[PDB]
Coordinates of C-alpha atoms and ligand atoms in Angstrom, one line a residue:
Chain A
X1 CA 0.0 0.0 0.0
X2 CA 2.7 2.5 0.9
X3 CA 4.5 1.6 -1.8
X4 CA 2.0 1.5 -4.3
X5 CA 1.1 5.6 -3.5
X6 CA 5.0 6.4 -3.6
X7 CA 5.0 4.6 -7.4
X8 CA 1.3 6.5 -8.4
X9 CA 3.2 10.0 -7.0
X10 CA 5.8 9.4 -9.1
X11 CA 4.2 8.3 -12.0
X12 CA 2.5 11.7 -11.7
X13 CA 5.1 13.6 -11.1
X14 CA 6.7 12.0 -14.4
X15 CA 3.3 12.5 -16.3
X16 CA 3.4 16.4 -15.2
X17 CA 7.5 16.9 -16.5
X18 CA 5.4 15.8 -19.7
X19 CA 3.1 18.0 -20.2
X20 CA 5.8 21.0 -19.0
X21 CA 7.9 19.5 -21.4
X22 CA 4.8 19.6 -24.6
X23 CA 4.0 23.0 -23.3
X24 CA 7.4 24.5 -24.1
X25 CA 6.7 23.1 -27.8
X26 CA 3.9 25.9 -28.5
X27 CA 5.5 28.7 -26.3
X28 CA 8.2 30.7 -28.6
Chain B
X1 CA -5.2 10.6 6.8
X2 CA -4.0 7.5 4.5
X3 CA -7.6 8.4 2.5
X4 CA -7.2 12.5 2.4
X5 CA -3.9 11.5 0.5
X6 CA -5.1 8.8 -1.9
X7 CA -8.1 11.0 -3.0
X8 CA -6.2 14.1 -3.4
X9 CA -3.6 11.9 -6.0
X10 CA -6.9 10.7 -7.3
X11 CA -7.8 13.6 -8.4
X12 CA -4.5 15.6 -9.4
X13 CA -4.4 12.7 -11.5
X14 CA -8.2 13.4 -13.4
X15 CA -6.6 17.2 -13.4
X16 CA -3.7 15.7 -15.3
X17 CA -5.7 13.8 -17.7
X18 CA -7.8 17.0 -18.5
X19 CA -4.2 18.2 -19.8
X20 CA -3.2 15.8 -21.7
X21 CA -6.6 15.9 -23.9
X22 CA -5.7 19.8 -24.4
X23 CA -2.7 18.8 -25.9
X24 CA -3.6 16.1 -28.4
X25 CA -6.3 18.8 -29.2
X26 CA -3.4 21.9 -30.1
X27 CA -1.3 18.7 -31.9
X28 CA -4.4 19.0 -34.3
X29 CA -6.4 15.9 -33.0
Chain C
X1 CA 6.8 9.8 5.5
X2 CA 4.0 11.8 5.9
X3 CA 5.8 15.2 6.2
X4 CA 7.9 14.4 2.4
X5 CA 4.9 12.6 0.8
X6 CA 2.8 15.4 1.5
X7 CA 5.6 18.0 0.5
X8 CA 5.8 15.8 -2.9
X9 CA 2.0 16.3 -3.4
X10 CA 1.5 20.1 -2.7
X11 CA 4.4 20.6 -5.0
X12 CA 2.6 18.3 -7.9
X13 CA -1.0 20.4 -7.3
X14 CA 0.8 23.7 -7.2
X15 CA 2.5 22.5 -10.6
X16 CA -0.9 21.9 -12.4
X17 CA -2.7 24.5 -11.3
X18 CA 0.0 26.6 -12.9
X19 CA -0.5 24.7 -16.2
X20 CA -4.1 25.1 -15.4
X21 CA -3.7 28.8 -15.5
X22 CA -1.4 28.8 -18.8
X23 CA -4.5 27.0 -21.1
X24 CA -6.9 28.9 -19.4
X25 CA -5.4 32.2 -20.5
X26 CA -4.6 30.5 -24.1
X27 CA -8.3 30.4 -24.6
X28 CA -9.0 33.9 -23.5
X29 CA -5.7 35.3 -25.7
Ligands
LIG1 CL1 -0.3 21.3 -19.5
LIG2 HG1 0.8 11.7 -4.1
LIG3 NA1 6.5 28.6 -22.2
LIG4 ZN1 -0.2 22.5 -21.4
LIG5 ZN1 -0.8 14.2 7.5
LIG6 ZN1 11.5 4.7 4.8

């Protein structure tokens, strides 16, 4: 269980350096 | 506490999902 | 670790309401 939550956190995290990552695509 | 946490991930996640679709929209989707 | 789990979280909202703010103004713009 502990685990599990520290993997889904960091998963998100991952997901969200993503989308920063496709946003600075369309910005100049 | 342990359920505050999970349903606050829970829904960052949803948040983060709602992103994604706005960028496969701009990509021309 | 509640005290670094929960830093780890607040960090991840604050970062997506950011990007939140970013395609909200896109629309307006
Ligand atoms: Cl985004
Ligand atoms: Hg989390
Ligand atoms: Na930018
Ligand atoms: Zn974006
Ligand atoms: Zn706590
Ligand atoms: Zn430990």
């Amino acid at each position: 269980e502990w685990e599990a939550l520290e993997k889904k956190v960091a998963a998100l995290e991952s997901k969200l350096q993503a989308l920063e990552k496709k946003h600075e695509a369309l910005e100049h």
